[PDB]
């Protein structure tokens, strides 16, 4: 997270950390709890090549990484069939937990938006995670969960932004209809925030607008962060997640 504070303890109960085996169960990607047994995350964290489930664990909302690890196992991974790279699109994936989670005041699911929501510019949206804090800098070793409030851009304005200073012809669409844009030179997600939720407070309710996907570096001029547009994939999600 570029910019922003440490998060208040109560504030983001659906945030998940994904761990990979090694000398220790290292954090590598974020996610969100959308149902007591399902986690929503970015496909490029787990694909396109298949992974052994021996190597993966899920951690719920701790405040500081690694201090209180109670690693949950994963029963299955599902990746959108259209995925191959993040710039092509369909960067979305599902994890099914072996054991369901006791929902609690401290651990609660995020709400998915109705398919009619567009999230026009000006909305109040936040992104959260344990990713890097400046363009090359690891989060320092207390490892707090950070948060930042980002601006939203309309897609066609975002596509124009990406064409500045590039050789790509202006006929060629860079930012696609299954994507969403947010952030600016002061406020962005970064490495290791991938797969984390972007949420917006619509009508008093927190809805997940998107998933941290890709960008041309962190906080760079005329390069907003690109997010997977969750409403675009609702029919694919509800084929598996028991609504």
């Amino acid at each position, epitope marked *: 997270i570029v910019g922003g504070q440490e998060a208040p303890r109560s504030k983001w109960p659906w945030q998940v950390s994904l761990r990979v*085996h090694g000398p220790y169960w290292m954090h590598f990607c974020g996610g969100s709890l959308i149902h007591p047994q399902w986690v929503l995350t970015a496909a490029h964290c787990v694909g396109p090549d298949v992974k052994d489930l021996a190597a993966l664990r899920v951690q719920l909302r701790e405040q500081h990484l690694y201090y209180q690890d109670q690693l949950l*196992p994963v029963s*299955r991974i599902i990746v959108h069939p259209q995925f191959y790279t993040a710039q092509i699109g369909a960067d979305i994936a599902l994890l099914e937990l*072996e*054991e369901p989670v006791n929902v609690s005041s401290h651990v609660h699911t995020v709400t998915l938006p109705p398919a009619s929501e567009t999230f026009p510019p000006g909305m109040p949206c936040w992104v959260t995670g344990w990713g890097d804090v400046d363009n090359d800098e690891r989060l320092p070793p207390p490892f707090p969960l950070k948060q930042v409030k980002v601006p939203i851009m309309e897609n066609h304005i975002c596509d124009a932004k990406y064409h500045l200073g590039a050789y790509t012809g202006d006929d060629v669409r860079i930012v696609r209809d299954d994507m969403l844009c947010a952030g600016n030179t002061r406020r962005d997600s970064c490495q290791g925030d991938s797969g984390g939720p972007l949420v917006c407070k619509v009508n008093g309710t927190w809805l997940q607008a998107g998933v941290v996907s890709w960008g041309e570096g962190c906080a760079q001029p005329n390069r907003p962060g690109i997010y997977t547009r969750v409403t675009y994939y609702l029919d694919w999600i509800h084929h598996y997640v028991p609504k």
Partner: antibody
Amino acid sequence: VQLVESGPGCVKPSETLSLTCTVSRFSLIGYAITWIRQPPGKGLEWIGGISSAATTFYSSWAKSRVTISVDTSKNQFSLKLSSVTAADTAVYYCARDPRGYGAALDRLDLWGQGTLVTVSS
Amino acid sequence: QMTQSPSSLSASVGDRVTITCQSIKSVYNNRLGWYQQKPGKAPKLLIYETSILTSGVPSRFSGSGSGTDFTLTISSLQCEDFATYYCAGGFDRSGDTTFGQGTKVEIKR
């Protein structure tokens, strides 16, 4: 990297049997352990186990009498079986599931050596 | 709950053998494996997730199965392949999982 069981070898009827498994290297933070029993000449039967999330699962008959527990301060897993009878004489094993599932038998990759327990007067 | 067959067999060195395991239902998610128990020591995992060969196992061993019926097959027997074999599988999460009764393989010589 290996497990070791421990136990009394001999117990009389109506005591409570205790067993203990210890992680010889690293810490099995993230991993799971199941307990397997083998009466002489018979095949294997599953007692129970504990998941990476610390959830315990017990076989049909084991719920009446078994408790499984973990203590990171000793890097150990422990089994207790109440009210033993002569028919409990078997080899006992602890084994690890690398996925961390508390109730699975298809991928027990790493095993202890096992210890006999004989129930006799 | 499962049955495994044959309960016993005898076969020469250089022969080929196959063993079956069956069930009333299907395995929740390719969760079936095969174990080799040498006499006097702990069982060893050989095959997991229906057909993945465990590392370091000589690729003499093979297996596959249709969710309800499963097979284990040798390339050809050696003397040290002597063991009892068990299938094991799981039919849900948290519940119905079991070993089979086991098959004991003995060598003509």
